[PDB]
Amino acid sequence: TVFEELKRYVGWGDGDERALRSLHGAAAPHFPRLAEEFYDRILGHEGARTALVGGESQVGHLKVTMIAWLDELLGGPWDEAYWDRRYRIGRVHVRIGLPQHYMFGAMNVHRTGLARLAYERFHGDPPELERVRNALGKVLDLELAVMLHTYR
Amino acid sequence: TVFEELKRYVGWGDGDERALRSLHGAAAPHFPRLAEEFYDRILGHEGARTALVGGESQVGHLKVTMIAWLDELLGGPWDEAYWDRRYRIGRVHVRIGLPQHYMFGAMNVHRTGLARLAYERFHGDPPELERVRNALGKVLDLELAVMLHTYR
């Protein structure tokens, strides 16, 4: 499978899983803010905003599901069940006809916010910041890999 | 096209371009190590390694073109001609039959190395680190977006 092959490629291990779970504790209180920044970016962008046409209640419901998505991202586990669920999430966006390039822009918003949260928490312990930064890069690149698999 | 719509989405500006140029000077002496790490990952991966059966000269030539790719990544400019060349690079990999998910694994190797060099150079100035780290995330995400466009 794509996730198994890529876990091997990127050197995914228990270290990455521990480091993400450490990040989860630091980041979870800020999930509402990360979701807010994510939708602010979609709604502020002329092309992306046209994908959201259910109004104020729609963004409210999407924030709830994105808080859950972030919780799973950093909490795991990152097993076949997890990745199977991520394929289904990719397919959702294929089916609504969302142009695939928006997935990269959107993931970059989370990448930027999560990287900042990692730095804020871990900068005083550089080797742990390195481990958390590295794990975060891997999980987000694997998420993209799996969600762009659904577009083919 | 995808670079222009996406550059607005991620907030690509002259600040990102200055940050990347500033990293270029610090990172460039380490490009050969980054390239070593990149090819060692391919050669150590059961699926990906089969793409490199052209011998020591193929790997040697690829290292040269990767050092150049990296120099362009951080030095720029990031103009129409740059992105047109990135499109052609993407198509090379489509033409040779490389599975698209390997592009994510391979980009992660560079992401991890480049993020480490950014920290090494800029950790004494946390606001500049933030700018450099943000710009690095954006350019790599844009690179993946363009590469994956060629696979469509």
Ligand code: HEM
């Ligand atoms: C990193 C990028 C993204 C992630 C992680 C993400 C995550 C999700 C999740 C978890 C769902 C719910 C799927 C379910 O029902 O189980 C969903 C649905 C949706 N997402 Fe996203 N999403 C992303 C990008 C985007 C973008 C860029 C847009 C629009 C600009 C978008 C618009 C939507 C819409 C409209 C739905 C609801 C679809 C429907 O059922 O009508 N998403 N997303």
Ligand code: HEM
């Ligand atoms: C971030 C990911 C990657 C980047 C930035 C990259 C970059 C490049 C560049 C700049 C070239 C030269 C293009 C040209 O001569 O016109 C190229 C060619 C090539 N790449 Fe990659 N590459 C990536 C991923 C991969 C992976 C994962 C593999 C194999 C596992 C691979 C195997 C090759 C091969 C075999 C060629 C030569 C094709 C030929 O014979 O003409 N590349 N790549």
Ligand SMILES: [C-]#N
């Ligand atoms: C999409 N939330």
Ligand SMILES: [C-]#N
């Ligand atoms: C391609 N190295």
Ligand SMILES: [Cl-]
């Ligand atoms: Cl950092």
